[PDB]
Amino acid sequence: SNPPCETHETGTTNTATTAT
Amino acid sequence: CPTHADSLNNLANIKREQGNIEEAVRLYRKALEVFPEFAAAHSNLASVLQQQGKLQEALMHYKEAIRISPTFADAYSNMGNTLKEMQDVQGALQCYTRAIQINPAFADAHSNLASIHKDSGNIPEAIASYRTALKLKPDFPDAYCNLAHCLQIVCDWTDYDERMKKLVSIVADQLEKNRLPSVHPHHSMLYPLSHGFRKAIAERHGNLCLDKINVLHKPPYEHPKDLKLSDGRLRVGYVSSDFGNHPTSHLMQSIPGMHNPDKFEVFCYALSPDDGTNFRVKVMAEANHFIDLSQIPCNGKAADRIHQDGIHILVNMNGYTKGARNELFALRPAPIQAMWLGYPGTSGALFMDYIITDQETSPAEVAEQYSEKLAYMPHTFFIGDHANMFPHLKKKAVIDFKIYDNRIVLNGIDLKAFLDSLPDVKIVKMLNMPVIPMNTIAEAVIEMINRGQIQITINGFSISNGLATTQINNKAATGEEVPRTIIVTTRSQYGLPEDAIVYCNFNQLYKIDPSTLQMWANILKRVPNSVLWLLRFPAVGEPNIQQYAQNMGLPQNRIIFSPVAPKEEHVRRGQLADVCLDTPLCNGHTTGMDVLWAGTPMVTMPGETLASRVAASQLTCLGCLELIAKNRQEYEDIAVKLGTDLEYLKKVRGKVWKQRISSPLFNTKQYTMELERLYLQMWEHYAAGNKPDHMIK
Ligand SMILES: CC(=O)N[C@H]1[C@@H](OP(=O)(O)OP(=O)(O)OC[C@H]2O[C@@H](n3ccc(=O)[nH]c3=O)[C@H](O)[C@@H]2O)O[C@H](CO)[C@@H](O)[C@@H]1O
């Protein structure tokens, strides 16, 4: 397989919803 | 009233942006108290709950928001982020694709979908989605910074200078406005950021752990002030998600067993489940106590466990990498907590006391970049298990197909015994090197390689094609077991020229920047018969390197690419190269040790960051200061000299080959003893009633 390396999960973006 | 609820929801969004998560939760809940069918409040509340580590509770509220409002795209995209964090990739994908289906112009959803492609290894698709996100929303730090890392991975350097400029300004603006920087702590080593920005980035990510433990409301732990409960033994706990087939175990799997059981009691805390490898088996067997914390997913209960064991020194081997549970260290269950080996940088966090390093890696003049106190090992903080994992590479022999030391190579545990059965070996005084003449036996070996045969038998000895290891013994190919047969490794196996200097670099391509390739092209241009040996790591980065090399003057035939290989073949084939050119932006670390164990001289140029200085520290401990450059000219000149002065090359290669053994670089017993001295220095300082200070001997 591919070699296991030092890995990091990519961050995501939460969406804040404003009430109008 | 909607207005009462709307104002509470809007104010909570403000509190959330200010980093006041506790107050945000409070205000969202008060909004739901006023207006229970408030879809936005459910989704927004779920976001901060996710941020507090309350994942299952977050999911409940997302689903409630979607029941109330079936086309609430924000909720789908936000739910996906939670599912992704829970390692439910399929669930996350389905939420993202749904949100995008509801609103194709939803930039956040595209950017989050991109992160899945990225983490799956589908970089072109990740790049495309990130660009769709930026097209819809040009001011989007998360999307831009992660795109920048995608381009780094595949060596896309289009407008690289403008990219760096943008990255730094993004971090600057984010730090000023007190946001979580879109640049990950590990990635910050690759960009021209100040040391101040890098440590700040690490500190903010450390804060995320504080958000997750504040809700636990646990009191400060009491800590042992003596070694009386432990019969005078220092209780050391190693915490890692990488006890198994991971570069980390490949480095230190022997260390827990080397520890002195009369003075030390070793506790290994695994953050990951058993993968069934001999790596996991060894640590479980040789540690005094092995605890599977993947059975205890609550950080409160987990930290409670560590504390019950009465740990004096708790060791962080993850840092900001996957599998980390830094919340355990944030709860301070031990009186002394130190960073070690796993993460090439500062935690930036107050809950860490020391970083175990060395004078060469982390000089006093750059101590500013760390938040921890420096704890110096006497040589290098780095270690490898190569002596235990690959003892079959300790000795070698060659075949005179014409005397080269790296054209056709034999290795094996039983190699000496086989050579004794051959009445015509020449012993070339280089240790000395056995040479098999071009006889019947040599012809059979070369025929095996040429015809692509798996394995032949000579005098009862199994001779193996080096390319066919997995077909012969999987456990041997991964490094779980020492190979039993005699392995053949040739330059013809990888399309390397027989009559030329081979410069190699076996790192992931993200470590290469345009400055580095320029420096390599300068070297190749000055060494007429020379090629550069790289890995398709990943393969899609290949046409990029090739094109940029053309633009620097190198024809494509000067650069040879090989696929990534199993662990054992990767270490072994390093013998075929003449010189390894280390990457200055971020050095080979594990792969640095891999290269030196193969007996291959590595040329390095240490930088300012820890990650850019590890190779120089390895070479210092190894005892080869002449391979350490002080600038780019010297780096080029050293590499060009090795490639042109073939007697000097013979001297240097011989020196490295001898020093793998005689230097303390691969000596895990001497390492463990020295590490124990450092631990005791740490403990006495604390036991005497002092806060941590630089243990620079
Ligand atoms: C920049 C970075 O991430 N550095 C870390 C990295 O080391 P380093 O930077 O040396 O290595 P990587 O994380 O890329 O891991 C690559 C792995 O692949 C293996 N390989 C390589 C090529 C190949 O063809 N075949 C093969 O099996 C190497 O032996 C290594 O085990 O992990 C170590 C273990 O956590 C840490 O100490 C280092 O700080």
Structure explained in plain terms:
It is classed as transferase/substrate. The entry lists the keywords Glycosyltransferase, O-GlcNAc Transferase, Proteolysis Substrate, TPR domain. The assembly is dimeric. The complex is a heterodimer of chains A (20) and B (697). Helices cover 0% and strands 0% of the residues of chain A. Chain A has no helix or strand. Chain B has 697 residues and is of the alpha/beta class. Chain B has five domains: 1-106, Tetratricopeptide repeat domain (Serine Threonine Protein Phosphatase 5, Tetratricopeptide repeat), CATH 1.25.40.10; 107-217, Serine Threonine Protein Phosphatase 5, Tetratricopeptide repeat (Alpha Horseshoe); 218-384 and 661-697, Rossmann fold (3-Layer(aba) Sandwich); 385-499, Signal recognition particle alu RNA binding heterodimer, srp9/1 (2-Layer Sandwich); 500-660, Rossmann fold (3-Layer(aba) Sandwich). In chain B, the strands form three sheets. In chain B, strands 3-2-1-4-5-6-7 form a seven-stranded parallel beta sheet, covered by helices on one side. A seven-stranded mixed beta sheet of chain B has the order 10-11-8-9-14-13-12. In chain B, strands 17-16-15-18-19 form a five-stranded parallel beta sheet. Chain B starts with a helix and ends in a 10-residue tail after the last helix. At the A-B interface, loops of A face α1, α3, α5, α7 and α9 of B. The structure holds uridine-diphosphate-N-acetylglucosamine. Uridine-diphosphate-N-acetylglucosamine sits between chains B (247-248, 250, 341-342, 344, 506, 508, 535, 564-565, 567, 570, 586, 588-592, 594, 611) and A (3, 5-6).
Instruction: Classify the secondary structure makeup of chain A into a structural class.
Output: little secondary structure
Write down the Rg of chain B: 27 Å
The ligands found in this model are:
uridine-diphosphate-N-acetylglucosamine
CATH architecture heading of the largest domain in chain B: 3-Layer(aba) Sandwich
Q: What is the CATH topology classification name of the largest domain in chain B?
A: Rossmann fold
Identify the quaternary structure here.
heterodimer
Overall shape of chain A: it is rod-shaped
What is the CATH domain class of the largest domain in chain B? Alpha Beta
Strand arrangement in the largest pleated sheet of chain B: 3-2-1-4-5-6-7
Distance between the termini of chain B: 67 Å
Q: What about the largest sheet of chain A?
A: none
Helix content of chain A: under 10%
Number of strands of chain B: 19
Radius of gyration of chain A: 17 Å
Q: Structurally, how many domains make up the residues of chain B? A: 5
Summarize the amount of helix of chain B as a percent range: 40-55%
- Greatest chain-chain interface? A-B, 19 and 50 residues
Could you tell me how far the N terminus lies from the C terminus of chain A, measured between alpha carbons in angstroms? 52 Å
